[PDB]
Amino acid sequence: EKQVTKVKDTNIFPYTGVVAFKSATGFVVGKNTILTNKHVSKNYKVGDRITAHPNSDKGNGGIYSIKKIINYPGKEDVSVIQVEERAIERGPKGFNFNDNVTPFKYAAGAKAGERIKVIGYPHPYKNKYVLYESTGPVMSVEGSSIVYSAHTERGNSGSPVLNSNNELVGIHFASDRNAYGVYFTPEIKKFIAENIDKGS
Numbered sequence: 001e002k003q004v005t006k007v008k009d010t011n012i013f014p015y016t017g018v019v020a021f022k023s024a025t026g027f028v029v030g031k032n033t034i035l036t037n038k039h040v041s042k043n044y045k046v047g048d049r050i051t052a053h054p055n056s057d058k059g060n061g062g063i064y065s066i067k068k069i070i071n072y073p074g075k076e077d078v079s080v081i082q083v084e085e086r087a088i089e090r091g092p093k094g095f096n097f098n099d100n101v102t103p104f105k106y107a108a109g110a111k112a113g114e115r116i117k118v119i120g121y122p123h124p125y126k127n128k129y130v131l132y133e134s135t136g137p138v139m140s141v142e143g144s145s146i147v148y149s150a151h152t153e154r155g156n157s158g159s160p161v162l163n164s165n166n167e168l169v170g171i172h173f174a175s176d177r178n179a180y181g182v183y184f185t186p187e188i189k190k191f192i193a194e195n196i197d198k199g200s
Contacts, residue, residue: 120159
């Protein structure tokens with residue numbers, strides 16, 4: 001069964017793991033490091049900004065500059081984004097990005113029939129950067145592909161796909177018939193871990 005709900009407060013976990021681009025979503029995976037789709041990252045450049053868990057104009061975890069973009073070498077629609085650690089506009093917990101957000105942890109796996117949740121910014125221009133959460137069942141898990149029946153829209157590109165314990169099963173990339181995400185295989189997890197910013 002499927003449920004879609006506007007999120008009231010984004011400054012609580014798991015919403016504190018999600019970020020907004022102007023046009024799409026991303027989420028935090030490590031030190032100064034976010035994940036989005038390659039079709040999102042190609043529209044941005046070093047110097048462009050992301051906002052940590054905005055709730056329209058009611059408050060957020062800060063504004064951060066993109067300092068590096070690393071596209072997954074395989075065909076999977078995944079991109080790693082590193083941000084400058086010191087915010088352009090401070091969040092409530094100081095200038096440090098890592099003090100204002102919460103990275104997501106990975107689920108051990110996923111299976112057909114399990115309930116997942118997609119959290120992101122659907123039609124962010126129209127909705128004014130309001131977070132929505134959308135739940136539904138996993139239809140199949142095959143290699144780097146996870147298919148689920150949950151409502152998604154434009155703007156949801158780059159949203160985390162979470163299990164019931166707020167752990168990552170994938171990253172959303174395509175709507176509609178079912179929704180498609182990239183399942184975190186060892187090769188993709190290896191790519192992400194290798195490109196998490198070490199810092200200075």
